[PDB]
Each structure stands twice: as structure tokens, then as C-alpha cells.
Amino acid sequence: MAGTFKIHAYTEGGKPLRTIYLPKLLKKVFLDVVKPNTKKNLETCGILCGKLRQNAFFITHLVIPLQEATSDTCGTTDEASLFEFQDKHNLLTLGWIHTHPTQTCFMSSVDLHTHCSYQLMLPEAIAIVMAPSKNTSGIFRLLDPEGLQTIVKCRKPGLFHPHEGKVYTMVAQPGHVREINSKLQVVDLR
Ligand SMILES: [Zn+2]
Ligand SMILES: [Zn+2]
After folding, report:
1. Does 111 belong to an annotated binding site?
2. Does the annotation flag 89 for ligand binding?
3. C-alpha closest to that of 41 among 178, 133, 127
4. From the CA of 43, which ligand is nearest?
5. Pair 111, 142: CB distance under 8 Å
6. In angstroms, what is the span from residue 24 Cα to ligand 2's centroid?
7. Helix (H) or strand (E) holding 10
8. Which positions fall inside the MPN domain?
9. How far is Cα 84 from Cα 79, in angstroms, rounded to an integer?
């Protein structure tokens, strides 16, 4: 009908990307759940989990794993329990979301290395970054193959370090991510 369209989304390398359906509620619900950390200027992450149905992914569960909260990272500390939870409930990893309580909306060095594993496993994988002090948010991915290659090769120690060239980009509007009016379940493993 009116205001509808078909999308064919491609990576930089020309690979077709399947659609990910994102609940309209997810961003705001996530900010609600992790507010105690945000008020302390501490980052929190959640994993975007779901299922593949008729050639498209549906995010159904926002899973908050055990993690180490700092002012500039929120790395998962117990991947075993996260994996066990996802396996038991047949939930795929589709991406992740995290806060920048006071920072601008961008992808940090750590964020790019974190995302690399997601997007190697699933070309469609996304990183949602909420920057509530700026009232902004963004959905990002690495360039594929070029950015994935840069991060795979990067051995710089040091929490925050620069990268040579363009490495990441915001998901286009419209593009392979579509919002839908769906229910949401938050699963907190903490
Ligand atoms: Zn970040
Ligand atoms: Zn690096």
C-alpha cells in the first residue's frame, strides 16, 4: 500500500543483507532498564536476540548479560551463562545495544573490536548506541569487507586507539533494519 517499498540492501562488497525487524519499544525500554548505571555515568550493554523466519530476522529478546560497568566500557564477563541461556531458548545473536551516558553517539575503539565478532558471525549484525545526554542514538555496522578486515588485523593493545581509514558506517534509512510494532521481553542475567 501507500508508503511501502521493497528493499534490497547490500554490503560494500556486494553481499545481500537480510532484514532485521527491531521492536519500536526496544531503545526506550533499554534506557529504562539500565537507568541506574546511566545516572552514575556507567555504560551498560544488552544483546539483541531473536529468530530467523521467512528469510528475515526478528529481535524478540533484549538480554542483559553479566558485565563490567565502567565509564567507557561495558564488556561481558560471563559468556558461558549468556550462551547457555541463548542455546536453551533457541535464540540467535543479531547484534547488541549499549549506552554512552555522557559521550557523543559514535563507535569507540572498543565498540569496533566488540562488533567485529558479531558481524563476522552474521553479516547483518548491528550495534545500537544510545547517547541519552545528547538525546540521540544511532545504528552502526563495520564496512564489509574492508572495515571487518581492518579490525581483524588490528593488534593494538590499549583500550582506546585510532584506526586507519574508514572502518564503520551508520545503517542507512531505509536499509536492512526496519522498526515494527512488536512486543518485547527483557531478560536480565544479573
Ligand atoms: Zn560505545
Ligand atoms: Zn583496533
Report:
1. yes
2. no
3. 133
4. 1
5. no
6. 32
7. strand 9-10
8. 19-149
9. 8
176 is in an annotated binding site: no
Pure H helices in the chain: 26-38, 79-88, 109-121, 146-153
DSSP tag of 134: G
Ligand number, closest to the Cα atom of 127? 1
Q: How far apart are the C-alpha atoms of 147 and 132, rounded to whole Å?
A: 27
Closest ligand to Cα 102: 1
> How many angstroms separate the alpha carbon of residue 79 from the centre of ligand 1?
19
Domain 1-190, classified CATH 3.30.565.10, yes or no: no
Looking only at the bridges linking them, the beta strands covering 177-180 and 136-142 are unpaired
Q: Please enumerate, as own/partner, the contacts of 111-118 that have beta carbons within 8 Å and a separation of 24 or more.
A: 111/140, 112/142, 112/147, 112/151, 112/163, 112/167, 112/168, 113/151, 113/154, 114/75, 115/140, 115/141, 115/142, 115/151, 115/168, 116/142, 116/148, 116/151, 116/152, 118/93
* Site of grid cell 556486494: 14
- Technique employed here was X-ray
Q: Kindly provide the resolution of this structure in angstroms, with one decimal.
A: 1.8
Task: Tell me the residue ranges of DSSP E strands in 35-125.
Answer: 45-53, 56-64, 92-99
Determine the Cα–Cα distance for residues 114 and 97; give it in Å rounded to an integer.
11
Measured over the CA atoms of residue 73, residue 165, residue 116 and residue 162, the dihedral's sign is negative
Report phi then psi at 36, rounded to 5: -55, -40
Q: Which of 145, 134, 59 is nearest to 97 (CA)?
A: 59
Taking the CA of 108 as reference, the closest ligand is 1
Ligand 2 centroid – CA 181 distance (Å): 37
